[PDB]
Amino acid sequence: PLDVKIQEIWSRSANITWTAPYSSPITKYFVQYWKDKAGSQMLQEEEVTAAHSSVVINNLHPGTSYALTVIAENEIGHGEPSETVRFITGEEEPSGPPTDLWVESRGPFTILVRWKAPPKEYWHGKLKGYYVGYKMEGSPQPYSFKTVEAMNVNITHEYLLNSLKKSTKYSIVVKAYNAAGTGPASQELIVKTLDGVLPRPPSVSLLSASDSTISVKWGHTDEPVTGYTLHYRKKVGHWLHVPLLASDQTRYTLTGLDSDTTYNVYVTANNRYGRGDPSGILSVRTGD
Amino acid sequence: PLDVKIQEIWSRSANITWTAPITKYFVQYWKDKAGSQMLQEEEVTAAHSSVVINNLHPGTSYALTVIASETVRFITGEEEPSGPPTDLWVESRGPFTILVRWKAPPKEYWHGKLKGYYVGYKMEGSPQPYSFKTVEAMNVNITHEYLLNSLKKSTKYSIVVKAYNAAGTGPASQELIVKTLDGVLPRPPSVSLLSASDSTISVKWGHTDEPVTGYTLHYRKKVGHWLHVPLLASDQTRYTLTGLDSDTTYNVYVTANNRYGRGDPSGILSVRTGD
Ligand code: NA
Ligand code: NA
Ligand code: NA
């Protein structure tokens, strides 16, 4: 038919509109529609009598791009007017929370939150951003929320909470949102700010591994650091402790290890007031 | 701290237990996944021989240490999956059968290792409850499938799939409404991509019960109108489109026709030409 229009759109429905085409008279109207993404899709079809200039398509997925064609079939079945349109269905609120919530850095006044986006299939509409809420753990007050950009092209998302109190436990949640509304919140993350007295946790990273050895490095930490302690253990085994008197030290190579064995490794910094909070704990398998 | 014990486990909690022959007790715990994790810590009095850790993730494996030293491992209790299966795909393969396929929900939403899936189906046009069938989890595989059979012909069915684990059942996928074939008109060919070039696209489909009199190949640009290539030849089972534009996305699908008329279409392909 000529002048095919999507007259109105819902999140799961769309009303299609056209005008009577060139007439051999029209036997029926044939409506095809399918998802407009890459890869093979289902070709949905639906008939309408020649007396109708309209139809409502139902059971569509929200926030999804569709292509649709109306065909005016003929007696002759030849040269039958066709026209294809493209549209996107209305939005619905995200149905899944962000995942893999993660603390990256910490200070006495700041907390760096990171998270991965909920899977695209649960967006039901392109995300407009995220809400990061936080509160002190033992407080009746509600969460106070901060707005973050969606950055939908990035794998990782992050936000730095600041102007916090020292040595305080905060509860953190993240929600995604789009034009329709807000999705569910992630599970509570309970994070304690530093004290500003003990050393900050080092940033430990894997340097090298072999059949018998593992090497790791970390950045120097901020009252003068008097030393570091490296901790390690087999996945089935007790913790062992390598004391590093040297504060020039930012590297260490474990030796005499077992082949094809997973070791855990983390580092702590010490100053005159005692041992600071630990790094992330690494999982490294002995190899080449 | 001798003989550390996980005395009991919940889905987000765990009670830890020990004896010790001291300043304080120091309780470290972390997720037992690969890659760098967060080392969570809590302190407890010297007067306590036990502590309850809170706000753990369900269906998650943890390692734990108590220091006055000794490290144990456990897995938190299960919770029901919180997401439905994705990428639902059903084609009426016959007048009596429908083959359903789906991808698993993202593992972050399992909250416990999946035991399988439930495939529910019912006639659309009459008020009925869904009748559910059990399928194995096959968590190793990327794609999952179930062939619904013993159906009526030329009937519309409503299809849903759910994941489930030891805690219970996850939410269902949105309805897929699919109609079984009539057993008269040709069954929809199964068309797949062979090759693409800057100027061409080549596709294939399966060979043949009533003798097929011909095929029609339909194609169009992502922005454009449908074009129809009639193939009265029923022998070859392949075709190569020519004269296309470079770096352009084309839709393609194939219909078969016999004495009774034109059969239901293929799946619709989306193929982009090379540079
Ligand atoms: Na068209
Ligand atoms: Na501290
Ligand atoms: Na065109």
Numbering used by the authors:
A (entry chain B): 297 to 319, 322 to 519, 523 to 589
B (entry chain A): 297 to 317, 324 to 370, 380 to 519, 523 to 589
Task: Provide the publication's sentences verbatim.
Thus, this kink conformation may reflect a physiological geometric assembly. The dimer interface buries 2109 Å2 of surface area, which is composed of one FNIII2-FNIII2 interface, two FNIII1-FNIII2 interfaces and two FNIII1-FNIII3 interfaces. Y420 appeared to be essential because it formed a hydrogen bond with P395 and π–π interactions with the symmetry-related Y420. Evaluated by the cKIT tyrosine phosphorylation assay, all the mutants significantly reduced the cis-interaction.
Furthermore, the cis interactions were established by the three FNIII domains of sDscam, which assemble into a cross fold with a kink between FNIII2 and FNIII3.
